[model samples]
Target chain A: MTRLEVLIRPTEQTAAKANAVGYTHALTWVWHSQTWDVDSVRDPSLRADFNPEKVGWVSVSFACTQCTAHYYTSEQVKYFTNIPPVHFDVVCADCE
Target chain B: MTRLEVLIRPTEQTAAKANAVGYTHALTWVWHSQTWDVDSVRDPSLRADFNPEKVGWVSVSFACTQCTAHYYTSEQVKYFTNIPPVHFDVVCADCER
Candidate 1:
């Protein structure tokens, strides 16, 4: 798998959020290919019952902060064969 | 040391982009804390000369599709002690998104 890494300069506000979340260290983003079902793709409320498929062509992006990390997966890679550009804001809170 | 994980559902267009980028498999996003300079954070044209610091409270998000993967690091975690919510669109062209 080929990987492209981009550096994000967080704003001051972002920094505050990280501090509040209790993150201490470097953040890294890792992407991989896998498949998932409709329930897993949509409906955040169904995350508990969602079943992800390990198909090819699926992609995911992960966010890591001090002690908090989050994940994003490509649903287009599953149902549709076409993938478009995607951008969205994400926040991760320390569960611990 | 703590991690919060979120899942994203890509659109049809995103799927096509992934196919064009030649990615296959599952996608995952991982975040960490580090420090960086203004050059690394602001000047996209100067990515080659950027020097990142390994400090505390930094965050990053990565995007993966097919055989291609991409990463996003938090600059706010570097300069300021405060971290805010972040979002953006990402595309991987396989290098060969």
Candidate 2:
């Protein structure tokens, strides 16, 4: 079984002329995949109930900041730190 | 430090007669808060880097499926399975709806 490690990155941002940086108000999710190791999830302190067979994908529906129509994705996306823009194809749910 | 324990629940769905269905393609995030324990994230196997001081709140920007304007929130919301719909106030970043 595959285990999903999900982490939330703060998107709060600031701009400094040419060096304008940090996150915007948008929520950024950085998720990675891992094999289900018996030693990890079994820990009582962690309280992790990772059963990839039962739940694997993440579904999200939201309206774009640029448009009126909503967009959604049903796959588990692995967001990389070095990647610019998004690595996946973002399509409008209503436009389709 | 407060550790944000985030978990992902599958949102794929199927509808039956009268019973309606479960999930509908929208990504659902169920997150909770826990005090940082030395025994947990320290485990070599879990590989959890929960530093609440550096990353405390989750920031999300999205346009509503129903409206043309966009909405965003910068807060760490606690979601409960027992609750129906969402428990927090969902206000639009543009429309204030």
Candidate 3:
């Protein structure tokens, strides 16, 4: 039986090693740190140090159909129903 | 110098092994095989066997910010300007963990 695993991190250096080993197909997101105002309103200046080129988070999964995997940030997962992790039992060409 | 690597596959088994080995952050997408008609129109019957529950493609990337990585399908890449691949030269906690 083959089970899929999901790796989550706040950086991509590990994803590089994962890619070096075989786990490619990396998805990345650029994020910023922001603070709320006393009135609970979003302020543009709250994230004055935001950089577009810097990726905030990354979610890497296997790029295979016979098998599949997923990962979501605690914040990203908040808007949607919790999806049970995925696992499969089959002969994967990539794995074999 | 450490460089980021991106892997692309049509399944998740390899991703699983990658995860088992420490690439725990995985992203997945379900895709289907489709065909075009004479008029290049999409037909409903084109994907009669399409299964929603079955993922067609999976794209997984590191879940960290000290570093970053990404991969796009040839088709997905067609919509926008090509972004150069990402590589970072930094010590990774998960790799050491």
Q: Which stretches of candidate 2 lie over 4 Å from their true place?
A: A1-84, A88-96, B1-66, B69-82, B87-91
Sort the candidates on lDDT, descending order.
1, 2, 3
lDDT of 2: 0.27
Better of 2 and 3 by lDDT: 2
For each candidate, give its TM-score against the true structure.
Answer: 0.18, 0.19, 0.17
Expressed as tens digits, the lDDT of each residue in B52-92 for candidate 1 is 23222324544433434544543222212222234322333
Report residue B74 deviation for candidate 1 (angstroms).
5.4
Where does candidate 1 stray beyond 4 Å? A1-57, A61-70, A75-96, B1-79, B87-97
Worst 10 residues of 3 chain B by lDDT: B40-49
In the range A1-96, model 3's lDDT, one tens digit per residue, is 111223233234344543454533322221111110112211111111122233332222222334452222211211112223222233334333
Overall lDDT per candidate, in order of appearance = 0.30, 0.27, 0.25
**What 10-residue stretch in candidate 2 chain A is worst by lDDT?**
A43-52
Model 2: lDDT of residue A7: 34
Model 3, B23-62: lDDT tens digits are: 3332222211111011221111111112223323222222
| lDDT per residue as tens, model 1, A1-96 | 123332222234345544554542222233322211212222121101111231122234444333345445433221111222333223333322
State which candidate has the highest DockQ. 2
